[PDB]
Swiss-Prot record, chain B:
This is Bifunctional cytochrome P450/NADPH--P450 reductase. Changing A80F: 800-fold binding affinity for laurate as substrate. High coupling of NADPH consumption to laurate formation. Very much more effective in indole hydroxylation. Favors omega-2 hydroxylation. The chain holds residues 4 to 456 of 1049 of the full protein. It comes from Priestia megaterium (strain ATCC 14581 / DSM 32 / CCUG 1817 / JCM 2506 / NBRC 15308 / NCIMB 9376 / NCTC 10342 / NRRL B-14308 / VKM B-512 / Ford 19). Changing T265N: High substrate-free turnover rate constant. Negligible substrate-induced spin-state and substrate-induced heme reduction-potential shifts on addition of saturating concentrations of arachidonate. The record marks T265 as: Important for catalytic activity. (9Z)-hexadecenoate binds at Y49. Functions as a fatty acid monooxygenase. Catalyzes hydroxylation of fatty acids at omega-1, omega-2 and omega-3 positions. Shows activity toward medium and long-chain fatty acids, with optimum chain lengths of 12, 14 and 16 carbons (lauric, myristic, and palmitic acids). Able to metabolize some of these primary metabolites to secondary and tertiary products. Marginal activity towards short chain lengths of 8-10 carbons. Hydroxylates highly branched fatty acids, which play an essential role in membrane fluidity regulation. In the N-terminal section; belongs to the cytochrome P450 family.
Length: 451, 452
């Protein structure tokens, strides 16, 4: 009945616990000490972090809870607006955009994206095969190159040409700096000292809007016919109201999909490669499957579908390190959680996804081991035990896109290269609003299989 | 490219090769001579028996192959209908029943089953502790008593009371005879001779006995406690897709299905596991140490059973050497090539010979015939699709976890409470119905005098 709560800092309550460079890993440690639920207070805010499948399965009841905007998502509205990810379920523009955009992530849409996914995946393989003796690969950097280029090409027929750059594209430099300022506003008054920080925020948002303007103007002047994400954005009509998306919302969606479309996916690929080089039994099993399934120089759509074990590898990477580590919920009415924790209408909850995926009562005692075989049979996983893509009607719309891209890329990587952990890399998880291994490097020796 | 094929008997082709009391062991011997794949022809049917992980890993690709109904499952349809095991994947009642009944095998359902599993397991332990001097135990018979009562109690709140009987329950007398007639329809050189007419008459009477018990189980439930067991989901559970529940014809097929599938293979597993334990005293000791330190209470709990790691490895190593459901069948969904060597047309049939697959020397090494539970410490070291005792994919065994929990609980209590003796130096004799069991397996067990 009485809820635990971590240590407090006077009038700041628990907020200084978040004044760290790895807050999710710190929240995981508090969960280890306090258990399945604890209260977290900050100036002007109260929330509750859930860690057990038992309580999270109740919070995922959509008749009792709706998506809440975390403080990180509230601040992100300054550039993402009422796009799909940063809008409330009751805002007209969510359901409208959800109806207009779901078709662009169907199976027939996936088949159309596949060719352009291979285009970028081939650029990755060729970069690595063009390395000189004893040169190494910066894994998370190259994964971000691939995932950003893939969403740009597949979604908008725009080429970021990340593999022609040693520095990151100016879009993500401002993207990262804007998100870093969002991060800073969490652990922060508005004294004059922050005037430059507010000025820098406005410049970085303008840089992103400038790219969006180029993407839209290129399409209007294009003259060709495309059938991608941008096409449904401009021409698709909501079957309810009959209306298409108006002009502010399209640019909010473009910004939204550019960011949501690439960051979590590159982290997933980076984590997947880390666990593979750290677990030679798994890597051999995954490389055997890639070799026997990907028999052509260019993988087909059906061939990617057949990489069952690579998909199990990816799901086991999402279990240990879900790259979007949390989502928020609020109680729609007065209700009781777990029969012991009463909640009022509007009370907020945090789902701590990494901790949910370490519930020993669900996954057994060995939660920290990397075992893709946990996912051999999907029906064996209890309901709401595995939640890397959110929940319900507010779940990740790009889930199938992300899993197809990652399976294609990982499969080609395993077919064409042998990888070495030549530095005996010690896992260092960097935290923005998502999770990535920082400094992860490998050496790859080509198997000399042509494309 | 060219596929081997065993000796033929004129117009009967390979069918007389199956006219034996040990056909699976006969098919294993043919595999030893012919290798990883061979063609087997019968009047009106062609199939291919697979034996290597190399080819079976491709056959388990669900995008290219679907579950096929073998002739054994086709004939079993006369009493199992379109229940879960004998229905085609494309029959509406398979997916519907799969959606409704999968929750009754979840972790929360297992915890609810656990008390009634202990109920039957204690009756077993008490029977053995009540034996007189120099009396022995009939292992497969007592395992069949336990597994049948466990599925009866846990699934349907019906007590077969097998430990109060000398002769088998009337249900399984007709059940064993019905399954025996299915086996006979397989091996018959000519299928409708006059001699078999009574055999068909007896077949129908045995089906009526089984259906009559189903009627009693259903009427007993209709006359109101409040249960949440397998039968409860059968009667009230609704398919989230179609919104509808199962109709009354299909429920009766499911009850028959789960009564049979729920116990026969599990009793064979427990018998084989106990056989390998008495034949390998180092393993038996290692498993006995674990039972002693984990089962510290007079009644084992759900968590304690979860902790019997070595006993679970013991059960998996018994399933490797003698998988009690010895085969399953597949058909090609489209034209495809197997192993880059064997072209298959749409509809072509395959048989997975599970005991032979589990003896693939390229997978398990030099000691394939040795009983070493250690082989299962790490699943990541086992190549993909090398271990298939519960079938494959969406048609894999739905009762897998229930079977593994029951057997782990029972074996653990057996090892905690008794020391076992192979007083006859029993020579393994594998009986074949549609499943495999050691016939005539007997032991002596002397109690450790630990109260319950
Ligand atoms: C590894 C890859 C990914 C992960 C782990 C992931 C995770 C998530 C999660 C947890 C949410 C729900 C957040 C919340 O409830 O507040 C979400 C929503 C969303 N994701 Fe992803 N995502 C991934 C890839 C993608 C991709 C590739 C796209 C687009 C191309 C995308 C677009 C979106 C959008 C638009 C939403 C909001 C959907 C809505 O509420 O209508 N994501 N994602
Ligand atoms: C040692 C114990 C067991 C073994 C070796 C075993 C083996 C198998 C195998 C190999 C299959 C697939 C057959 C095929 O593909 O044609 C299967 C399916 C099935 N088993 Fe078991 N089983 C065991 C225990 C159980 C138990 C305890 C139950 C129920 C209480 C059960 C119920 C079923 C059902 C309903 C199916 C059909 C599933 C479907 O196709 O939807 N089995 N089993
Ligand atoms: O990380 C988060 C939520 C961020 C979710 C990730 C967003 N994403 C990205 C892609 N898919 C989802 N943290 C909390 C912590 C906090 C609590 C109380 C007071 C201040 C901050 C928050 O933002 O509210
Ligand atoms: O052993 C089998 C399959 C037996 C599977 C056991 C069924 N079970 C029980 C529990 N879970 C599955 N054999 C073939 C033999 C045959 C080949 C050609 C012509 C006729 C017969 C068949 O049935 O077709
Ligand atoms: C709005 C937004 C979308 C995705 C990420 N990773 C951060 C912020
Ligand atoms: C239908 C059927 C189910 C189980 C067994 N062992 C045989 C037949």
């Amino acid at each position: 009945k009485e809820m635990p709560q971590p240590k407090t800092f006077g009038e700041l309550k628990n907020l200084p616990l978040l004044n760290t460079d790895k807050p999710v890993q710190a929240l995981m440690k508090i969960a280890d000490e306090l258990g399945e639920i604890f209260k977290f207070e900050a100036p002007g805010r109260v929330t509750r972090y859930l860690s057990s499948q038992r309580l999270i399965k109740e919070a995922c009841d959509e008749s009792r809870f709706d998506k809440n905007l975390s403080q990180a998502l509230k601040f992100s509205r300054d550039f993402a607006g009422d796009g799909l990810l940063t809008s409330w379920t009751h805002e007209k523009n969510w359901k409208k955009a959800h109806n207009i955009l779901l078709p662009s992530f169907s199976q027939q849409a996936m088949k159309g994206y596949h060719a352009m996914m291979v285009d970028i995946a081939v650029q990755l393989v060729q970069k690595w095969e063009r390395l000189n003796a004893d040169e190494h690969i910066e894994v998370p950097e190259d994964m971000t190159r691939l995932t950003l280029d893939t969403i740009g090409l597949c979604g908008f027929n725009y080429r970021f040409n990340s593999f022609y750059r040693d520095q990151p594209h100016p879009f993500i430099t401002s993207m990262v700096r804007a998100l870093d300022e969002v991060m800073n506003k969490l652990q922060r008054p508005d004294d004059p000292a922050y005037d430059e920080n507010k000025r820098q925020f406005q410049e970085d948002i303008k840089v992103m809007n400038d790219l969006v303007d180029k993407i839209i103007a290129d399409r209007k002047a294009s003259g060709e016919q495309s059938d991608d994400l941008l096409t449904h954005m401009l021409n698709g009509k909501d079957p309810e109201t009959g209306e298409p998306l108006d002009d502010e919302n399209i640019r909010y969606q473009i910004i939204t999909f550019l960011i949501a479309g690439h960051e979590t996916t590159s982290g997933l690929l980076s984590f997947a490669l880390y666990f593979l080089v750290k677990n030679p039994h798994v890597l051999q099993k995954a490389a055997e499957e890639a070799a026997r399934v990907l028999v052509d120089p260019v993988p087909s759509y059906k061939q990617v579908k057949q990489l069952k074990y690579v998909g199990m590898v990816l799901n086991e990477a999402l279990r240990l390190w879900p790259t979007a580590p949390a989502f928020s919920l609020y109680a729609k009415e007065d209700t009781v959680l777990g029969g012991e924790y009463p909640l009022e209408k509007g009370d907020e909850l945090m789902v701590l996804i990494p901790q949910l995926h370490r519930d020993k009562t669900i996954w057994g005692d060995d939660v920290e081991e990397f075992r893709p075989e946990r996912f051999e049979n999907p029906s064996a996983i209890p309901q709401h035990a595995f939640k890397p893509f959110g929940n319900g009607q507010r779940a990740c719309i790009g889930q199938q896109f992300a899993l197809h891209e990652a399976t294609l890329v990982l499969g080609m990587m395993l077919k064409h290269f042998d990888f070495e952990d030549h530095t005996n890399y010690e896992l260092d998880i960097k935290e923005t609003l998502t999770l990535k291994p920082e400094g992860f490097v490998v050496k790859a020796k080509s198997k000399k299989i042509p494309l």
